[PDB]
Amino acid sequence: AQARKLVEQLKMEANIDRIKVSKAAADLMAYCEAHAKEDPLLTPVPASENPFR
Amino acid sequence: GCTLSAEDKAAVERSKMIDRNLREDGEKAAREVKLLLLGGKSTIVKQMTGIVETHFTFKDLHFKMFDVGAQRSERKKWIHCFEGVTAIIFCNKWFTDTSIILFLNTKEIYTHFTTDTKNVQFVFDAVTDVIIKNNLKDCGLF
Amino acid sequence: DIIVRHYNYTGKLNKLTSVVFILICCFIILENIFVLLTIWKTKKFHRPMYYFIGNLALSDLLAGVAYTANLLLSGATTYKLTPAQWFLREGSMFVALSASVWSLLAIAIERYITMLKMKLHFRLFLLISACWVISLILGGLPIMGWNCSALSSCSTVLPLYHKHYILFCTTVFTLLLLSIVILYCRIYSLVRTRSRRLTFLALLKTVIIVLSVFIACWAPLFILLLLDVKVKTCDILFRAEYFLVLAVLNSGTNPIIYTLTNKEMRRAFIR
Amino acid sequence: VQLVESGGGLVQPGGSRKLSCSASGFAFSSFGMHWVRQAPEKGLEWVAYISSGSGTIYYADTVKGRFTISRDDPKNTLFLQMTSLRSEDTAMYYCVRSIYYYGSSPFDFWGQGTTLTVSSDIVMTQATSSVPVTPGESVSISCRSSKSLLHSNGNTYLYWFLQRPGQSPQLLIYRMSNLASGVPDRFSGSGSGTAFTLTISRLEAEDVGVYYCMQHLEYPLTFGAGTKLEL
Amino acid sequence: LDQLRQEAEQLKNQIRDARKACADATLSQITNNIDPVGRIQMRTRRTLRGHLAKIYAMHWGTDSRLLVSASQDGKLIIWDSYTTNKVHAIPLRSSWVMTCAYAPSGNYVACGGLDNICSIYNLKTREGNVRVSRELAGHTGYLSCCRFLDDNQIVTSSGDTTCALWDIETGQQTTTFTGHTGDVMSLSLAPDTRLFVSGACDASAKLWDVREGMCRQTFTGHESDINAICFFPNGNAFATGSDDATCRLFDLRADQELMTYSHDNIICGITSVSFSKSGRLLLAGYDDFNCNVWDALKADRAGVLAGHDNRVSCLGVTDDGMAVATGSWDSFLKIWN
Ligand SMILES: CCCCCCCCCCCCC/C=C/[C@@H](O)[C@@H](N)COP(=O)(O)O
């Protein structure tokens, strides 16, 4: 029965250690800012080292 | 390129040969025209799992006909990939401008009636027509 | 020194209309820059044909600006300075007119090739540069050895100039006219046959118009120049003020006859 | 993959002769070819080059004009023409397969060669002539470059080959850093500009012969004296 | 089944109540404290020419120097972007191709489309020329997307409304995935190659695991087809491009979607999306002929890759993230730095 499968899926989804939205938000922002020093299309580089000029 | 090294010349020559082959391939490609058969298609399929791609000729012009005679549902990537067709033979966001030739017994629609070699001749005429206007749209002459 | 003596030999030696003609030229410039800006800002109009249209607009703009400069240069000092300015004016007019005519015929060539029944499913820069270079060369010929020790062969409309290169240029202009008319009638024949035989057009209601405005804008000068070819005998040959302007007024209709026939150009021009 | 040479023999002084090569087992069209020479008692010496497409042909400074090279793709065949043979032409002659796109391995398949008997440039210097070795012992060889073969992009066109007794040379290292296919791991070697060193780890067996270092940075392609090992 | 439906509604209410206790705001509501990128200017650095039809997909090699792309002229091209050199050219089995993949080792490329077969080609062979290595058959509807897992496993999805995990040497399906009422359009390979996200023409997407053959979650909220999907290389997000004139970003642990990107001039759908190597420049193609370089943390600013005169099908960035390629219906690959 599709209803039984839906019940099982929703029970499995409920039985998950849900986090606060701010947790994943700060995680994403910290990942972005931690590697923010290396983004090539936002951090300038001398044009000699540029293989596409 | 006098600044290059010995092997860059060989790489450049290889890339240029690839370019030559691509150009010839596309030149021979760009002539063949396209007919989407849907369904007088009974004599059409014989006079000119999945869907059937077929290749034929007529009057020194090379035709490709695609048969989707089992597609009676809504098209998700059939109709998006079918933008590139020059005639839809019959027996949305995409086909509001495609000429629909129609057999019996903007979106211009013809009607023809048919030993019966006309089955082919008819559509051949439409081919020329469905091209000519397009080229006029290029030259501002219409 | 030849200026005064030849002008007396012809009797030509002895400004609101100039202002009006300057305004006309400025109007022509405004229309042509309107067309050029319109075909600059549409990302769908970067096929070679619109580049040909831009070439025509630029040629007509050059002709208009050069003739405006000629109008501003009017004065007594036209018989008080070195013939260099006279030759410059002459050559500028010849190069501008020839460039415009050859651009028109090049556009006709493009249209006739693209839809000919062999391309019915490179030459760009070749043709534009060929037209420009041929026009510039023809414009520079007189100061290379073709000019009047030939007081008999000196002309009337331009008194310090010879009398066969005029026949040459009239011949080439007539040739180009016939070429254009043949190309367009042949396109009409092709479309008419190939779209009528199949029993499923309103073409010529524009084609002849492109010819029409051309003829009325080109004949009146092309007649008077022929009337040039009897010292100080034909008095009408000294009133060109209202004649040559018609020729440069030919630049005033190309921003209409070549754009205002298709819906896309209309939409782009309006907004 | 097979290349078979032919057209070798003995010739009286004065005249001309021919060499040929037949290929089988690969797409012959996407490869350029080299002809290479070897003296009866000495090292190697490059002869000539023909390019994939036929638009480029290179000869050597020592016999230019006397030779020529050609290829025939319809039949997958390679040809060499030589004229006015002098005493300094008696040698073994090999054909080599080569390919150049971004990342390919050139000089990676050698033929079997044929005999021919007759009755400015960068300098590569091989360190020595012979070195005594014992099984299981680490080995090292070095050669020196009279110029900085390294380039502004990172390439360095020096090659390392090996010749076992009675056989053909076998590519070991291309562009002085990269191992070839079908070669054990125990070979290695590195260097810096103008000084390069091949290293062999745990000499086991079938590594007796002569080792060679070549450059490719510009034509002509020059060889060194060679370095043999005994065991 | 009244009791089952009632308990399902109770579980839904429990999920909503748990959602309300943690959901307060979004990224584009708190990340405003970061310095906006402002006006960014990009320019063509090369222009890769040679395709002679509509280009439908491109894909980078892992070295960040080689590129594979496919066009509807039935052709598959591998490029050197540094020197504009063409390295390889593969003529395909038929024209109606839709997807591309590259092998992260560099030895293989796999393509597919309407003919219900996924083809696999070997690059580095001893014969010195490419040949077809495998043809996976068994699907009935058209093939949408394909991404190598390694030299020995692949994953595809098709018009069958199903997905399939395949072993190349055996030639037979080793896992199958069912549960879609509409056609599936694309799917995205995770960085670690252990989870997949697949969107379908039912205004929904689903999360799949290869080793389990059973989905964990389904994502809904759009209004129309889903033509574009990709990841955020941290492995905790994925961005959807729909035909309702909107792009969204979906989170996995939040039980919702993260961001919404839309504008009024977009009266059309999203042809493609893609991410920046660091996570600060989202890229989107449209039917309005632009390529909007959206920002991610601010949902308001933008740049443009102006220079295309037709529809932008596909766009992707390298692994070192120093260049960007776009392929379009104008038939030109454009390299941008
Ligand atoms: C280079 C070949 C030219 C052939 C082209 C044919 C049409 C162009 C002819 C020029 C018509 C303008 C006439 C006036 C020119 C000015 O220098 C006036 N100031 C002359 O004054 P005046 O003393 O004359 O009243």
Asked whether D154 and D193 are in contact (CB, 8 A), the reply is no
CA distance E93 to D19: 42
Give the Å distances, CA to CA, from C47 to B97, B139, C54, C61, E309. Answer: 22, 10, 11, 22, 10
Nearest Cα to B51, choosing from B32, B72, B29?
A: B72
Give the Å distances, CA to CA, from B18 to D31, E19, E51. Answer: 14, 57, 12
Residue holding tokens 């080689």? E66
Residues 6+ away with beta carbon under 8 Å from E17 = none
Residues 6+ away with beta carbon under 8 Å from B93 = none
Q: How many domains does chain E have?
A: 1
Query: Is C216 part of any known ligand binding site?
Result: yes
CA distance E5 to A10: 12
Helix axes C84-114, C123-140, angle to 10 degrees: 150
Rg (CA), chain D: 18
Experimental method: cryo-EM
Inter-chain contacts counted by CB atoms under 8 A, chains A and E: 119
- Phi and psi for E107 in degrees, rounded to 5? -100, -15
CA distance A17 to E253: 9
Residues 6+ away with beta carbon under 8 Å from E38 = E301
- Phi and psi for C164 in degrees, rounded to 5? -130, -30
AA letter at D146: S
Longest dimension (CA), chain A: 65
Ligand 1 center to residue D25 CA distance, Å?
Answer: 79
Query: Are C and D neighbours with ≥3 CB pairs closer than 8 A?
Result: no
CA distance D230 to D135: 11
Ligand 1 center to residue E148 CA distance, Å?
Answer: 76
Dihedral of alpha carbons C51, C53, C55, C61, sign: negative
Tokens of E152: 């020995």
Nearest neighbour of E87 by CB, restricted to D25, D27, D102 = D102
Whether E236 has its CB under 8 Å from any CB of chain A: the answer is: yes
How would you class E126 by CB atoms within 10 Å of its CB: exposed for 0-12, middle for 13-18, buried for 19 or more?
exposed
CA distance A51 to A44: 14
Chains touching D by CB (3 or more pairs below 8 Å): B, E
∠ Cα C132 C134 C135 (to 5°): 65
Query: Is C223 part of any known ligand binding site?
Result: no
What are the DSSP E strand ranges found in E49-161? 55-60, 66-71, 75-80, 85-91, 97-99, 108-113, 117-122, 131-137, 143-148, 153-158
Cross-chain Cβ contact E26/A24 below 8 Å: no
AA letter at D102: Y
CA distance D81 to D72: 14
Is ligand 1 within 6 A of the CB of residue C89? yes
Dihedral of alpha carbons C193, C199, C205, C206, sign: negative
CA distance C157 to C225: 8
CA distance D47 to D49: 7
Tokens of D37: 């020479």
Alpha-helical runs (H) found in C151-203: 165-196
How does B62-96 read in b/e, with b if 16+ C-beta sit within 10 Å?
A: ebbbbbbeeeeeeebbbeebbeebbbbbbbeeebe
H/E element, D161: strand D158-163
Residue holding tokens 């501002």? B140
Range of the domain at A22: 1-53
AA letter at E120: I
Q: HEC profile for C101-128? A: HHHHHHHHHHHHHHCCCCCCCCHHHHHH
How would you class D58 by CB atoms within 10 Å of its CB: exposed for 0-12, middle for 13-18, buried for 19 or more?
middle
Query: Is C240 part of any known ligand binding site?
Result: no
User: Listing from the earlier edge strand, what are the strands of the sheet with E246-251?
Assistant: E226-231, E237-242, E246-251, E257-262
CA distance C203 to C183: 14
Q: CATH no. for residue E183?
A: 2.130.10.10
Q: How many domains does chain A have?
A: 1
Nearest neighbour of B6 by CB, restricted to D102, D153, D218 = D218
Tokens of E126: 């001893």
Tokens of D96: 């080599």
Is ligand 1 within 6 A of the CB of residue C12? yes
Domains in chain D (CATH in brackets) are 2-118 (2.60.40.10), 124-229 (2.60.40.10)
Q: Per-residue DSSP letters for C63-93?
A: HHHHHHHHHHT-SGGGGSS-THHHHHHHHHH
**Nearest atom in ligand 1 to C13's CA:** 23
Nearest Cα to C142, choosing from C92, C180, C87?
A: C87
AA letter at D12: Q
How does C216-235 read in b/e, with b if 16+ C-beta sit within 10 Å?
A: ebbebbbebbeeeeeeeeee
Residue holding tokens 């070439």? C55
Nearest Cα to D217, choosing from D159, D149, D160?
A: D149
Domains in chain C (CATH in brackets) are 1-270 (1.20.1070.10)
Asked whether C85 and C73 are in contact (CB, 8 A), the reply is yes
Ligand 1 center to residue C90 CA distance, Å?
Answer: 7
